[PDB]
Amino acid sequence: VLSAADKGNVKAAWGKVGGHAAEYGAEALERMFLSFPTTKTYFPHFDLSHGSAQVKGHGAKVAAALTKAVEHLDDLPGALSELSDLHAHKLRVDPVNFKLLSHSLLVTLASHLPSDFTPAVHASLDKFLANVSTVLTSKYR
Amino acid sequence: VLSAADKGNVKAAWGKVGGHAAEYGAEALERMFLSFPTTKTYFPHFDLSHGSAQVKGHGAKVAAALTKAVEHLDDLPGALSELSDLHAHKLRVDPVNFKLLSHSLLVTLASHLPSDFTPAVHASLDKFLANVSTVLTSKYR
Amino acid sequence: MLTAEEKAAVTAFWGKVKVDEVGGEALGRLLVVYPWTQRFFESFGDLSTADAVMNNPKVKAHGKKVLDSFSNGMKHLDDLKGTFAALSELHCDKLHVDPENFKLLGNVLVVVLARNFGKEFTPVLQADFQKVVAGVANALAHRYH
Amino acid sequence: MLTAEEKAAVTAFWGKVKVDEVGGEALGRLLVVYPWTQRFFESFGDLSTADAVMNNPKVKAHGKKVLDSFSNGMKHLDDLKGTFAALSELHCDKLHVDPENFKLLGNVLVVVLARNFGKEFTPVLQADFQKVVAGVANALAHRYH
Ligand code: HEM
Ligand code: HEM
Ligand code: HEM
Ligand code: HEM
Numbered sequence: 001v002l003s004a005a006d007k008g009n010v011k012a013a014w015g016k017v018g019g020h021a022a023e024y025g026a027e028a029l030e031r032m033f034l035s036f037p038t039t040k041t042y043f044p045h046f047d048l049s050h051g052s053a054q055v056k057g058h059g060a061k062v063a064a065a066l067t068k069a070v071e072h073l074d075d076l077p078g079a080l081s082e083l084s085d086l087h088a089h090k091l092r093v094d095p096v097n098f099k100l101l102s103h104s105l106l107v108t109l110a111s112h113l114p115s116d117f118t119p120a121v122h123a124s125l126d127k128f129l130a131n132v133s134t135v136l137t138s139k140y141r
Numbered sequence: 142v143l144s145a146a147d148k149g150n151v152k153a154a155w156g157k158v159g160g161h162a163a164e165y166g167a168e169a170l171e172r173m174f175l176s177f178p179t180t181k182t183y184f185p186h187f188d189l190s191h192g193s194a195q196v197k198g199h200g201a202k203v204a205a206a207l208t209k210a211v212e213h214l215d216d217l218p219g220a221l222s223e224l225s226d227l228h229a230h231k232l233r234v235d236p237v238n239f240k241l242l243s244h245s246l247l248v249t250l251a252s253h254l255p256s257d258f259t260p261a262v263h264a265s266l267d268k269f270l271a272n273v274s275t276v277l278t279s280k281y282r
Numbered sequence: 283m284l285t286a287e288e289k290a291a292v293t294a295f296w297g298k299v300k301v302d303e304v305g306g307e308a309l310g311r312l313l314v315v316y317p318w319t320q321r322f323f324e325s326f327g328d329l330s331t332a333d334a335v336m337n338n339p340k341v342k343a344h345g346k347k348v349l350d351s352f353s354n355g356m357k358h359l360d361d362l363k364g365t366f367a368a369l370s371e372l373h374c375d376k377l378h379v380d381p382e383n384f385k386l387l388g389n390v391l392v393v394v395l396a397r398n399f400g401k402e403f404t405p406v407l408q409a410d411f412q413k414v415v416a417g418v419a420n421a422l423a424h425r426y427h
Numbered sequence: 428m429l430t431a432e433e434k435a436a437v438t439a440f441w442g443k444v445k446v447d448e449v450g451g452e453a454l455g456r457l458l459v460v461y462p463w464t465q466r467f468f469e470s471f472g473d474l475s476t477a478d479a480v481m482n483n484p485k486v487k488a489h490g491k492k493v494l495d496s497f498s499n500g501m502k503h504l505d506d507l508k509g510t511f512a513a514l515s516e517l518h519c520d521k522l523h524v525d526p527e528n529f530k531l532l533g534n535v536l537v538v539v540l541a542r543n544f545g546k547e548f549t550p551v552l553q554a555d556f557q558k559v560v561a562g563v564a565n566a567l568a569h570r571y572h
Contacts, residue, residue, distance in 0.1 A: 001218045001225075001279040027550070035554040038378045077142045084142075092321035096380040103534050107553060110542035117542055119459040120477040126460050127279070134275075138268075139317060140142040168405075176409040179523050233466035237525040244389055252396040252403055260314040261332040263393065267315055280462060420572040427565040427572065 002127055007073045009124035013109065014070045016116045024108050025063030026056040032104040039097055069132050080135045087136040098133030105129060143268055148214050150265035155211045157257045158250070162208060165249050167200025173245040180238055203242075210273055217276045228277040239274035246270065283359045283417065288410045295399075295407050296356050304398065305349030306342035308391045310335050316386050322379060352391070355418050366421035374425040381423035388415025428504045429558060437555050440548075441501050444540070450494030451487035453539045455480050457532050464531075467524060497536070500563050511566035519570045526568035533560030 002010070017024060033040050033048055033055070040048055047054045065083060072079035087093045106125060110117045143151070158165060174181050174189055174196075187195045206224055213220035228234050247266060251258045284292065313320050313335045320329045326340040335341060351369065358365040373379040392411055396403045429437065458465045458480050465474045471485040480486060496514065503510040518524045537556055541548045 001276060001281040003281045006281070031550045031553060034550045035557040038380075041378055088317070092318045092324075094318045094321070094380055094383070096382055103537075106538050107541045110538045111545050111548060114542050114545065118477070119456045119481055122456055122538065123460045123462075123477070135142060137318065138142040140144045140147075172405050172408060175405050176412045179525075182523055229462070233463045233469075235463045235466070235525050235528070237527055244392075247393050248396045248403075248408060251393045252400045255397045255400060258397055259332070260311050260336055263311060264315045264317075264332070278463065423572070427568070 002073060002124070002131065005120075006124040006127055009121050010070055010073065010128045013113070013116060013121050013125060014067065016113055017109070020112070021063035021067055022056075022060035024059075024105070024112065025061070025066075026059030028101065028105040028108045029055050029059045029062065031107055032101050035104065036097075036100045039100055042091060042093060042097070066132070069128070073128070076131055076135045077138075077140060080132065081141065084136050084138060084140065088139050093137065095133065095137045098129075098137060102126070102129035102133060143214060143265070143272065146261075147265040147268055150262045151214060151269045152211055154250070154254075154257060154262050154266060155208065157254055161253065162204035163197075163201040165200075165246070165253060166202075166204030166207070167197040169242060169246040169249045170196055170200050170203065172248055173242050176245065177238075177241045180241055183232065183234065183238065207273070210269075214269070217272055218279075218281060221273065221276050222282060225277050225279060225281065229280045234278065236274065236278045239270075239278060243267070243270035243274060283362070284410060284413060288413075289359060291407060292359075292410050292414065293356065295402075295411075296353070298399070298402075299349075299353075299395070300398075301349045301353060302342075302346045304391075304394055305345035305347070307336075307345070307398075308387065308394045309345030309348055310338070310341050311390045311394060312383075312387050313341065315390060316383070319383060319386075322377065348387075352418065355421075356414070359414065359417070362417045362421040363424060366418065367424070370422050370424045373422055381419070381426060384419035384422045385416070388419045391415055428507075428562060429555060433555050433558075434504060436552060437559065438501065440552055440556075441498070443544070443547075444494075445543075446494045446498060447487075447491050449536070449539055449543060450490035450492070450497075452481075452490065452543075453532065453536045454490030454493055455483075455486050456539065457535050458486065460535060461528070461531050464528060467522060493532075494536075497563065500566075501559070504559070504562070507562045507566040508569055511563065512569065515567050515570045518567060526564070526571055529564040529567045530561070533564045536560060 014021070030050075033043075040046075046052070046058070065080070068079060069076060077084070106122065106129075109125065110122070155162070171191075174184075181189055184199075187193065187199070189196060206221070209220060210217060218225070247263065247270075250266070251263070283289075313323065313329060314332045320335075323329065323341070323344070326338055326344075328334040328338060329341075355362060355365055373384075392408060392415060395411065396408065428434075458468065458474055459477045465480075468474065468486070468489075471489075472483055473479045474483065474486075500507055500510055518529075537553060537560060540556065541553065
């Protein structure tokens, strides 16, 4: 559960992300696939080569969803309903993979925003991604 | 996140528990201490010998907080705010220990309610306990 | 592992288990309680409701093979690693099962033994079985760690 | 562990690392991001705020020893199990730290490296370091599993 401070922290960080959300989305996926190659098994139809345009388009979609989540921190289950349907009912993604992606995203954000990525922002973003991951892996409709 | 089916399963199951909640609370803690003896280091001031009155008394309080929880499934963070303060701010309990007690409780319920402890009820209860655990391990005020 | 005391206790308890039934129930409960585990069995057919999973004939058949694998483990408690070496390779190299899932199945099995045996599944025996299933889970996870 | 080209890239990156700064930072963020970890360091003084934790002199000094320990690991990548055996027993038998926490600190360290090096901590480099920290985590977990 996010504090008021957590939600303020998440917004402030995503505000610093700004127009680069798509790029960071792409890089987080790239790092996930490279560091944790068993994740690539959910993407057998993807071109997963280095710099693949397909990964970049998918990273943009992943970042737009998170941008959506940040505007609805008080009702993630309502905002993410359709994505839970996809990741929990259809794809049946093991939760461990959400931890791998969440970590890849913290790595990406920390590398690009060294002055904003304070320890408290890091703490808040980790809780936020865990919360998102819980929604996306839960069957609740 | 719980579905409406999960919530009816949780309330129906804990209704079946009824006046045995205290007893089952104590037996969950006993099974936890016995099976996972590192959890005992959270309670160095207790007498933890077999059938300790202190453990039985502590089991009743744990069961009573779950009863409260069952009555507030749509707002666990509000309902359990004081217990979160104790478990996340004061005691600093590692989340692993919540998984151990949650499991001990499932083992306890399964053995006393073999007919009511169906795969569906088992699933809902597990979700419910995971959500309680998340509340009690999160610092959110 | 266990003392000779704990081995005989666990052995004698295990003799009461209806190996088939318990296997089916445990595998079924894993798929119902931790539903992402269904992805590994998507060839098994209908897994859309709890009833469908439990009554799925392939789940029941496979649950029996899982439990027979455990009963063999019960005979080799001092060398769980070697006993499970081929299954460790299979679940890692071909199946890509995350090892956290081994612990979940071991716990679900424990819950199933409790359900089926009630008070006979004593706190003491449950504790010793937690050692067995953590042992089997560690042996299956050998080819990553 | 790693190919010879990998150890080479990893060693050469590691020579860039300010162990004082990075170890203080990593231990600090462990206690801030995963606040229950503070329980194990309760004698260290005030850890009630993020600034308190990161300014805490004992946290800095201990984080530096953690990284020296890791630096030592970096020299023995084919024998992390033996290298970390004594620490494995210490964290298990004396400190009772759940082994999940070993992976969390390893990940926090990777995040700190990225924060401190930006572009230079490339995805290929980070992937190799993931293999290192997972190997250290597993070595430290050996006296349970
Ligand atoms: C932060 C958590 C995640 C978020 C926000 C997220 C978001 C998304 C979005 C927005 C889509 C596109 C849906 C569409 O096309 O409209 C998608 C699809 C998908 N996601 Fe995720 N995702 C997350 C985690 C994961 C993880 C951990 C995996 C597995 C490793 C995964 C596997 C997939 C797959 C396989 C697809 C379908 C891709 C395709 O066929 O086009 N997702 N996700
Ligand atoms: C669903 C999970 C849990 C619930 C509902 C729960 C509930 C409670 C309750 C109601 C109290 C007493 C509050 C009072 O003083 O009146 C308490 C205290 C406490 N709990 Fe928990 N708890 C849970 C998990 C855990 C776990 C996993 C541990 C550690 C292994 C733990 C350790 C403690 C300790 C050390 C106390 C203080 C005992 C004392 O001196 O009185 N709790 N908890
Ligand atoms: C104690 C833990 C486990 C044991 C003892 C076990 C045992 C076995 C055995 C004996 C087989 C038969 C392989 C053969 O005859 O070729 C098998 C196959 C398999 N296992 Fe497990 N398993 C365990 C955990 C898991 C878990 C947790 C998962 C996934 C969540 C899993 C997924 C699979 C799959 C997908 C197969 C092949 C099924 C098929 O024929 O399509 N296993 N396992
Ligand atoms: C990458 C994993 C880790 C490494 C390499 C590591 C390394 C070390 C080292 C070198 C020491 C000093 C040993 C000595 O000189 O006697 C130590 C002590 C200690 N470690 Fe760790 N550690 C790790 C993970 C953790 C985690 C995750 C925790 C707790 C969450 C932890 C808790 C402690 C504590 C409480 C001490 C004693 C500190 C004191 O004197 O107060 N360690 N560790």
